[PDB]
């Protein structure tokens, strides 16, 4: 809250970007960041790790629009030792030892919350406790800059295009052009006109205990409890008491749970978890209506 740095963070799986970063479960492979000295208004050199994933496959996709080569990715170290390497330059280039402050500042949602959080849980990574909280510079960006678009038309070309900078991406291969020009709409933001102040990000729950909101689960093993589907969704905010395994007409668990989260933000998250992995099963990912949870817990 109120940090002295934003660490802007930008991560590039092996599959798909955009708006379905994170939608096809491919693995982080490629993690770009930079330091920003907020009240120096001042930004830091961009910062990348590679990151070897379990399977070296790239979509052709990701292939063409990150141009990473492979090679070089297959001598990476992989997620666990890249986030303690992420995490031991920040604090060592931030000098955190003195007690100064940061939180981390991505583009939207899906960096954090569909990518960091159920990759880590799945390959029983522990992630420093920065990854559980960030701003969201589109919806910063929102408070801060009147006329802008609708948060969900914002990205980083719109966000920079509206302050009137060129997109570096014409000489800044893919991810580091963001984060870039994220730096730049930072500095623009916390300066005149607009004098932003960032305050309390958005968190990340790790504890566990509308329609709209509501998704049901379909497909969990025999031996799933509880705290299972929870770290299905983890990135997510479930509301309190907001998870429960569905039993049927005899009182056998039926494999299905109802899970309300915090916001139609977050359902349409899980959404995007459809047929994802609990080990090796698919679980199914629907939306589901707010009259079953209350008969359920």
Same mark, same amino acid.
């Given at each position: ?79 666990? @030792?890249?986030?303690? $390497? ?7 280039? &931030? %000098? +955190?030892?003195? *007690? ?122 025999? @031996?799933?409890?509880? $705290? ?7 990135? &997510? %905010? +479930?509301?309190? *008491? ?56």
């Amino acid at each position: 809250a109120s940090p002295d740095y934003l660490v802007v963070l930008f991560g590039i799986t092996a599959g798909a970007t955009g708006a379905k970063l994170g939608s096809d479960e491919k693995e982080l492979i490629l993690l770009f960041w930079k330091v920003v000295d907020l009240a120096n208004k001042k930004v830091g050199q961009l910062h990348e790790v590679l990151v070897r994933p379990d399977q070296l496959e790239l979509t052709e996709d990701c292939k063409e629009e990150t141009k990473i080569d492979v090679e070089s990715l297959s001598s990476a170290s992989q997620l666990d @030792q890249a986030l303690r $390497q992420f995490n031991q330059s920040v604090s060592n280039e &931030l %000098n +955190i030892g003195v *007690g100064t402050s940061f939180c981390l500042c991505t583009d939207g949602q899906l960096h954090v919350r569909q990518i960091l959080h159920p990759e880590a849980s799945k390959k029983n990574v522990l992630l420093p406790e920065c990854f559980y909280s960030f701003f969201d510079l589109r919806k910063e960006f929102k408070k801060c800059c009147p006329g802008s678009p609708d948060i969900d038309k914002l990205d980083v070309a719109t966000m920079t295009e509206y302050l009137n900078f060129e997109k570096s991406s014409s000489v800044s291969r893919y991810g580091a052009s963001q984060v870039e020009d994220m730096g730049n709409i930072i500095l623009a933001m916390i300066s005149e006109p607009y004098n932003h102040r960032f305050s309390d990000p958005e968190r990340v729950n790790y504890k566990f205990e509308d329609d709209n909101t509501v998704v049901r689960a379909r497909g969990l093993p025999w @031996q799933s409890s509880d $705290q299972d589907i929870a770290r299905f969704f983890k990135g &997510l %905010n +479930i509301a309190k *008491g907001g998870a429960a395994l569905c039993l049927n007409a005899q009182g056998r668990r039926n494999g299905e749970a109802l899970v309300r989260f915090v916001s139609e933000e977050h359902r349409d998250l899980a959404l995007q978890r459809h047929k994802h992995h609990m080990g090796t099963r698919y679980i199914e990912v629907y939306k589901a209506t707010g009259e079953d949870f209350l008969k359920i817990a």
